[model samples]
Target: ARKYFVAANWKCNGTLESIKSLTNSFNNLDFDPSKLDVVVFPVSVHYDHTRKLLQSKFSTGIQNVSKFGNGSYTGEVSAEIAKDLNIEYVIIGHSERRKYFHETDEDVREKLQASLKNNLKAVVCFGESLEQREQNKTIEVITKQVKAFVDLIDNFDNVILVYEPVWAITTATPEQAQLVHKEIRKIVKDTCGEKQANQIRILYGGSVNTENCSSLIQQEDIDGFLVGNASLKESFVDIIKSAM
Candidate 1:
């Protein structure tokens, strides 16, 4: 069986002061390492400090990484630099980047490659829009997105996939999540091969609150979660506790 995992994507939230606050909150939790694993993806600027604050009790990742390595790409954090800081993971192809910044799957592929090259774990996000769901094109859209990075994975290790349906980002029901998780599991096995896919932890993202996380996480294909707002508050521990 795959180990249970939970990742917090702080997104554009939190300042340096808030990082300490959040770090302290996590430090206070009596997290059961034997029951589950935890990972955090803070804004790029706070990577080093957050890890130091936690003293490696928790794994740290970046919200995004540059598709290109070390260059004049203003305001970009390269995977190499992140690895140099000993960062444990990096999140790529988040819906915000896709919708707000217009990141293409090709860009996700490049970033994933750079992340793997530097030995940083990567959590790749992909999902269809509300309209696509209404048209019943969920599978078609997700297949293309999944294919974008499946072959780019040079090593089968250090990679995690998160599926957050655009329409249900915050309003997703546990049943709906289970259905999609099943589909994603089949697609990963088909695209990346069964052996590797089984070893992978496919997580459900968006509005992963304490109330629903327990039931949602029990699904066969749902290895863990990618939490948003809940992750920043004390309640995040409740979500993690439910998984145990």
Candidate 2:
């Protein structure tokens, strides 16, 4: 059986003082790390502070990584720098990054390769927009996105997949998520292999909260969550307990 994985994408939120309080709450939570894997992605600035405050059982990841290695790129955090900071994971292809920052499929692939090359795990996000879902193009769009980096992934051990349907950012019914997650696994099976398809921990993101998380975690294909807003609050601990 695959272990449940829960991650908090703090996004562009939180101050230093807030992070201190958040970490204190998380550190005091009682859960077996062996059964569940929890990772939090604070904004890049708090990487070190969060790392120092968070317990060893829980991990800290970066929201993004530069496609290029260390160089003259201004305002970029490269995989090399992330590794040097002892960051364990990097999130690639987030919807906001794709929408606002205009990250291309090729750029995501490069980021994945860079992260893996530097021995950092990657939590790769893939999802379809509201229009695509309305037009029944969810599978097509997601397939293309998954295939963009599938070839570069030698193994699924260092990778985690998030199915954050754009339309249902918070409104996707549990059934809807399970349907897409099942299809995602099938795509992985078709492109990668059955072993990888089975082992990969595909998470449900977007508006995942304590009330809905219990039902979400029960889905056959939905292994865990890549939480957004709720992750920043004390309720995040309750969400973690739901998985337990």
Candidate 3:
């Protein structure tokens, strides 16, 4: 069975003091490792310190990794450097990065390759905007996104997939999430084989939080969440417990 996966994306939103306070809050959380796997991708500035400040029960991840191996790629953190610090996972293709940073689909695919090449588990995000959803293009957009993986990733199990709707983020209901989550899994099965698709864990990452978490976790296909603003608070533990 797929492990229940919950990841936190601090997303360019934290300082040294906040990192200390947030990691400190995780000290009292109690979870069964067999039942769930929790990972946090703090801002790159605080990633190393966050990794050391936190416990081993939870894994550390980087918000982004450089497409290049090394050299004069100024303002870039290479996957090799991330691995050296014992970072187990790296998140790629986040919507914010795509929207604000102009990350192309090819750029995302290349980084997925880089992350896998360096042996770091990749948390890949894919989804449609409100306009696309209104036009009923959810399936088309998501399928094209996953097909990039179908073409590049030989084994789907090496990566974690997240579906985050741009418009419906904090507003998505449990039932609405279930329908999309189910569709994404079926896309994985059609693109990859059943064996590989079964091992893939798909997460929902729009404004996931405490009130709706219990019902969201009960969905048949949604493996877990990729939380945003909610993750920086103690309520994040509540989200982890909901998965447990």
Winning model by lDDT: 2
After superposing candidate 3, which stretches have Cα over 4 Å from the reference? 154-156
Please, what is the whole-model Cα lDDT of each candidate in the order they appear?
0.84, 0.91, 0.85
lDDT of 3 by residue, 1-244 (tens): 7888999998878888888888989867977666788999888878778988888888889998888887899999898888787788999999999998998788899898888888889999989988998999988998888787655666565699998888685378888889998888888788776777788889998788888888887898888999998998977999999888
Q: TM-scores for all candidates?
A: 0.94, 0.97, 0.95
Score candidate 3 by TM-score against the native.
0.95
Candidate 2 residues lying further than 4 Å off, grouped into runs, are none
Best by TM-score: 2
State which candidate, 1 or 2, has the greater lDDT.
2
Model 2 CA RMSD to the hidden true structure, in angstroms: 1.1
| Per-residue lDDT of candidate 2, residues 1-244 (tens digit) | 8889999999999999999999999989988888899999999988888989998999889999999999999999999998988899999999999999999889999999999899999999989998998998998999999999987777687799998888775388899889999999999999888999999999997679889999999999999999999999987999999778
RMSD of each: 1.6, 1.1, 1.4
Clash pairs of candidate 1? none
lDDT of 3 at 164: 88
